[PDB]
Structures are given as structure tokens and as C-alpha cells.
Design a protein around this ligand. Structure first.
Ligand SMILES: O=P(O)(O)O[C@H]1O[C@H](CO)[C@@H](O)[C@H](O)[C@H]1O
Ligand SMILES: [Ca+2]
Length: 448
């Protein structure tokens, strides 16, 4: 077979049978052979096993003559930022995301933090590692510890005009991941009053593995917002490249609406820019981007496709409905920090609540939310859906699965690249009833 831990976009698997220090060392050796010239940035998340996996990566890299820049315990976006900022040859983030306790993984980038994915180096690394029975060499290069976050923090703060910020009360929920470290470093530079929930990093995860999409985790942020009269709340996943917003009523804001909201925020600073978005949910983004004077650019979902489209378009911002937000000046990479700074600035400057900023958009373009299906035969199920709707002659687009635009409603139906799942998204033109009847109709067909 092949090593299961090597996935489409990253490495992830159970420790130690799918991922271990031996494999991590071999990955470091193989990565050295795939990169252009330069040092390699290494960082890791709060999981208990992550430092030892990083140390093994460093040992293999240095055995291959790569200088290593250890940026320590960090968020995934810090590996991206420092890889680009320090003009490194590449970088690796050791992170398990929201996988179980016995799991870990790696996210790999080359120069300018460009993703390394299955077809752009990751399976080449896998195949090298799979066949590597060489004895480990000894280090011929050095490791340097670079824990200075000054340039990173300055970069984050550059997205807002600090003199215009108001002393909003913000709930922040790190989920015992790593986000609180950065919040606390930003706080002396910000006027906000923070209400800190599950703030301390703890790889034992006493309050659950960080995942704000799970309703019981969602409710912890909502409750803190409501009980403290906070202006809004922010929660992160463990490596905080994803952020999740709760308005002052405690309501979780579906990520679709943040794409248009952030696009308008960015377009105020970079007028006429292009904005990349995915095909799952589109109408609101296209309208908000165009209204703000930007140009929307449709792109298949998946961070590697988004980033490569942003680069070829010089796009100022890209956003996915799945809580991923990419910024041109941030090495075209995603950050879980820039978005809430931008939203705090928008609330401060406009005098409008986060709820108000999105309310009419969510009424105008209601969406189903992403609904996932594990079916016996994905291809046959998609065909049942398309045959059912054939007599209505929808406009079809195959950018990313199937998008079908019926006029007053549309859907996107695609296979996941990271799980053996079918993913459904439906939206309508201001019609909640049509949204529900079509969502249920499609669901019945998929399950038939
Ligand atoms: O499983 P999917 O849907 O192919 O991909 C999922 O993981 C990718 C990497 O995190 C994201 O960029 C996608 O937006 C998300 O939907
Ligand atoms: Ca993450």
C-alpha cells in the first residue's frame, strides 16, 4: 500500500503507527531534497507529542545540510508568515488540528509559504520516505531559535488604524489551543476589553479538542458573550488558522457571510482589488465585492487552489465559507488573527454591531450551511440529483463538483478532497421556504 498519513493537503495520522519520530525524520530528509536553497522554518502546536515530532524533523533536515529556524510553539499562520518574512526555503508546522488525542500531523510549505500538496511535492516526499531505508546521518547544519514575534505582531496590527478603534468588549475563546498567546501579545496595543474563555494552552484539552463548529463548544463562546454583554466573540481552532464569530446576541455567524464582510473591509483599504471566493456559496460575496468596487474571482475550494488563484490575479483577499481567510500581504496565506482585527475595526468605525453588519445579507441570501453525506455510491447519488432537476434546465458549472443555478436558488454538490464525503450547499434569493424545501428534496435524493 502507501503511507496513509499522507493526505491531499497535509500529513496527518495516528501516532505512532501512522506518524512517528522515525517517519518525521525521514520526512525532514525528503523535504530537504524537494526545496530550493535556504533554511527551513519549524513550528508546532500545543499537542503533547508535537515538539518531539518537530525535533525529529529538524534532525532529518539538518542531517541533509538544512539550517533550521525553530520558531517554537506557534500558530500555523506564524510558520507561513516567518517562512515568507525570513525568505526561507520552506517551513513545516507540526499540528494535529482537531484530530483525536492519539493523532498528529504536519503542514508543509516551500518558498513564500507556497503550499506543498499531494501533487506539488507531498506525494513525492511520501514516496521518498516510503522507500528510504538509509541509516540516519548526523547533523551538518545548525538550528537557531527565533522566538521574536515583533515582525509578525506588527504585520497583524498594520491591517487596522489603531486610533480609530473603540474599547469594544470581546470574548476570546482559544479552546485551550494556542490563540491566547497572540491575543495577549496584541492586547497592550489595542483598546479592547477581553473576556478570556478556555484561554490557557493545554494539549490535554480538558474542555475538549478545539472545534468551535461543534454545538457544545459553540455554546461556551455564545454563553460568555451573552453573560458579559460583549460586543462579539471570537473562537479559534487549535492552531488558530480558523476563526469563528459570535455576534452580541450569542448567535454564531455562518462563515459564508464573513467572506463578503471581510472583502468590503479590505476593499476600503485596497480599492478596486480582486477578491477570490469558492463556488459553494457565491451570490452574497459577488454582490458585496462588486458593491465595494472589487472584482470577484471564482475559484475551486481548497486552500492551495485559492492561494494560487490569488497569486495569479494579484488578489488582495480570498475567503472560503469554511472559515479560511487569505491576505495578499500575508504571503497570500490564511490567518485566524487578521479577520477579527478587521471586524473589530469595522464595528468600531461604523457604529454598527456585528449582528447589524450581516443581518440583511443573511436575509437576502439564506443558506443551508454545509451538509455532509456519507452515501453508498457518491457518483450514483449525484446522478440521481441531477436527473431529478434536469427538466428545469439549470445553468451548470463544473468549477468544483457541480454548481446548479436555477434562478431564484442554486446549489453546489462536490466530493471532499480531505474525506470520502459528499458536501452540499444551497442558497436562495431571499426565500427561506424555498431553501428548506430544496435542501430537503436534495437530501432525500442523496440518501435514496
Ligand atoms: O474537504 P474539502 O471540502 O475538500 O476541503 C476542506 O479543507 C480545505 C483545507 O482546510 C479547505 O480549504 C476547504 O475549504 C475545506 O472545505
Ligand atoms: Ca487549523
Amino acid at each position: 500500500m502507501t503511507l496513509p498519513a499522507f493526505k491531499a493537503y497535509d500529513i496527518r495520522g495516528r501516532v505512532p503507527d501512522e506518524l512517528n519520530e522515525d517517519l518525521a525524520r525521514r520526512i525532514g530528509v525528503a523535504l530537504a531534497a524537494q526545496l530550493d536553497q535556504g533554511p527551513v522554518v519549524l513550528g508546532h502546536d500545543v499537542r503533547l507529542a508535537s515538539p518531539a515530532l518537530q525535533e525529529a524533523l529538524s534532525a532529518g533536515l539538518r542531517a541533509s545540510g538544512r539550517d533550521v529556524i525553530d520558531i517554537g510553539l506557534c500558530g500555523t499562520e506564524e510558520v507561513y508568515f516567518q517562512t515568507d518574512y525570513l525568505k526561507a526555503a520552506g517551513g513545516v508546522m507540526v499540528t494535529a488540528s482537531h484530530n483525536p488525542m492519539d493523532y498528529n500531523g504536519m503542514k508543509l510549505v516551500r518558498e513564500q509559504a507556497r503550499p506543498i500538496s499531494s501533487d506539488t511535492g507531498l506525494f513525492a516526499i511520501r514516496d521518498t520516505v516510503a522507500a528510504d531505508t538509509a541509516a540516519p546521518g548526523e547533523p551538518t547544519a545548525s538550528e537557531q531559535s527565533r522566538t521574536d514575534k515583533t515582525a509578525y505582531l506588527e504585520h497583524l496590527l498594520s491591517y487596522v488604524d489603531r486610533s480609530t478603534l473603540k474599547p469594544l468588549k470581546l470574548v476570546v475563546n482559544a479552546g485551550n489551543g494556542g490563540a491566547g498567546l497572540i491575543v495577549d501579545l496584541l492586547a497592550p496595543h489595542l483598546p479592547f476589553e477581553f473576556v478570556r474563555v478556555f484561554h490557557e494552552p493545554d494539549g490535554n484539552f480538558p474542555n475538549g479538542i478545539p472545534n468551535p463548529l461543534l454545538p457544545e463548544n459553540r455554546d461556551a463562546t455564545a454563553k460568555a458573550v451573552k453573560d458579559n454583554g460583549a460586543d462579539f466573540g471570537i473562537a479559534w481552532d487549535g492552531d488558530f488558522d480558523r476563526c469563528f464569530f459570535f455576534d452580541h446576541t450569542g448567535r454564531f455567524i455562518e462563515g459564508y457571510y464573513l467572506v463578503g464582510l471581510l472583502a468590503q473591509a479590505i476593499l476600503a483599504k485596497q480599492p478596486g482589488g480582486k477578491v477570490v471566493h469558492d463556488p459553494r456559496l457565491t451570490w452574497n460575496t459577488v454582490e458585496q465585492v462588486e458593491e465595494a468596487g472589487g472584482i470577484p474571482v471564482l475559484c475551486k475550494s481548497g486552500h492551495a487552489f485559492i492561494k494560487e488563484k490569488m497569486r495569479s490575479e494579484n488578489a488582495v483577499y480570498g475567503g472560503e465559507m469554511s472559515a479560511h481567510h487569505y491576505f495578499r500581504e500575508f504571503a497570500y496565506a490564511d490567518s485566524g488573527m487578521i479577520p477579527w482585527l478587521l471586524i473589530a475595526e469595522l464595528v468600531s468605525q461604523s457604529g454598527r454591531s456585528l449582528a447589524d453588519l450581516v443581518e440583511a445579507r443573511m436575509q437576502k441570501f439564506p443558506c443551508s450551511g454545509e451538509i455532509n453525506f456519507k452515501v453508498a455510491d457518491a457518483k450514483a447519488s449525484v446522478a440521481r440529483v441531477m436527473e431529478h432537476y434536469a427538466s428545469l434546465s439549470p445553468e451548470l458549472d463544473y468549477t468544483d463538483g457541480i454548481s446548479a443555478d436555477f434562478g431564484q436558488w442554486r446549489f453546489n454538490l462536490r466530493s471532499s478532497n480531505t474525506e470520502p464525503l459528499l458536501r452540499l450547499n444551497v442558497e436562495t434569493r431571499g426565500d427561506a421556504a424555498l431553501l428548506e424545501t430544496r435542501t430537503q428534496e436534495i437530501s432525500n435524493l442523496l440518501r435514496g
